[PDB]
């Protein structure tokens, strides 16, 4: 299963989704209720620590697998305003983001384009969630076609 979230400035969430394969339809079995937001909020901090490092632990936008915990790796992207696109990947065996590392860099850039496109509405303040029906189709067609 895959968990994806856009974490704001004060760490308040603005987009919150999971998407998973049809083999296990009820995804993340007894982690989605009780560990899956805690590992996200706990491992915001190493992403925050990596925002002021010139070289990691000459792009500084994509970040690799930044944490690995029970065999779940997370990947991160620090945008220009500071909204961080952290996403947890889950599998059966040891999951590899290295098979998609060339791929899903153009998933983070193609959701950052959607965040910039929903920033320019002047009625949209900061620190309020994205209550957009267009945004769901615009992220899940990108998740279906490019994983």
């Amino acid at each position: 299963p895959q968990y994806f979230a856009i974490i704001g400035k004060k760490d308040n969430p603005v987009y919150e989704i999971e998407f998973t394969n049809a083999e296990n339809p009820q995804g993340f079995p007894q982690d989605l209720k009780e560990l899956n937001p805690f590992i996200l909020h706990a491992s915001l901090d190493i992403v925050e620590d990596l925002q002021w490092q010139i070289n990691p632990t000459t792009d500084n936008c994509y970040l690799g697998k930044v944490d690995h915990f029970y065999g779940l790796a997370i990947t991160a992207y620090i945008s220009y305003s500071g909204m961080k696109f952290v996403m947890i990947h889950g599998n059966s065996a040891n999951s590899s983001v290295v098979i998609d590392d060339n791929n899903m860099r153009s998933f983070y850039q193609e959701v950052h384009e959607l965040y910039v496109k929903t920033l320019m509405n002047p009625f949209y303040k900061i620190t309020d969630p994205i209550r957009s029906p267009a945004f769901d189709s615009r992220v899940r067609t990108l998740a279906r076609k490019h994983l």
Binding site: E34, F38, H41, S43, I46, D49, T57
Partner: protein, 248 residues
């Protein structure tokens, strides 16, 4: 066999040095006993215990896994305790790794970076010892695993490791490396006695607090909460829980 007499000496040597290593109390100040395994030396109880542990670890490394890793950890603890006293055991303690660099690989002369290499090799030797039966003694022949005693080695490894990071602009150990070297134990953690599991989460919270990681703290106190709730016995009120709920 020669391996049978070497196994007898391997059983003998580490325990024969361990009580003399445990014969130190407030650096052995004016405790003149009957002089049978209690020397009451002035400032050489650590030196005599270090020589005993050096001979014992040399004999166990000549008899080369579990007791070997305990012997290498005993030699590391004897070198660290002898260096903890401000004494002349510096060149002798650095050259006392004659079998420790033969079985392990220390290869350093710094402030416990040699002990960092010896501790990493000790955890590697205990990890090699994990490829065996789960419990090798008599009363530990049907025990939990080796997973209840690897964990006591690496938590005191972290407890000795993170104190090198004093906050200032020199960092003796980069800030990420013990954050890496505490996440290696994702053992199942399913069953053991509970008062180990309070203590491991409490000191893992304290090492995250002294590093300055204010959300991994919330993660490990949430693990402490979940471990406290699901215990099958009954517990009582204590004012530790008051300030625990206050800090969370």
């Amino acid at each position: 066999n020669r391996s049978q007499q070497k196994s007898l000496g391997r059983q003998m040597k580490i325990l024969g040095n361990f009580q003399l290593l445990a014969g130190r109390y407030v650096d052995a100040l004016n405790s003149f006993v009957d002089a049978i395994t209690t020397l009451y030396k002035v400032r050489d109880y650590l030196w005599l215990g270090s020589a005993l542990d050096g001979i014992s670890i040399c004999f166990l490394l000549l008899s080369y896994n579990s007791i070997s890793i305990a012997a290498m950890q005993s030699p590391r603890n004897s070198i660290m305790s002898l260096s903890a006293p401000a004494l002349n055991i510096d060149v002798e303690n650095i050259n006392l790794p004659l079998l420790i660099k033969c079985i392990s690989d220390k290869v350093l002369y710094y402030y416990d970076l040699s002990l960092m290499h010896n501790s990493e090799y000790a955890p590697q030797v205990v990890y090699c010892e994990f490829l065996l039966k789960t419990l090798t003694f008599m009363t530990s022949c049907y025990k939990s695993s080796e997973f209840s005693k690897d964990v006591l080695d690496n938590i005191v490894k972290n407890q000795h490791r993170a104190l090198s990071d004093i906050p200032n602009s020199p960092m003796f150990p980069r800030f990420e490396v013990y954050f890496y070297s505490n996440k290696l134990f994702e053992l199942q953690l399913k069953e053991m006695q509970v008062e180990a599991q309070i203590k491991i989460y409490s000191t893992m919270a304290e090492v995250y607090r002294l590093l300055g990681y204010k959300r991994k703290q919330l993660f490990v106190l949430r693990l402490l909460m979940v471990a406290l709730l699901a215990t099958p016995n009954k517990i009582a009120w204590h004012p530790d829980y008051r300030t625990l709920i206050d800090t969370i």
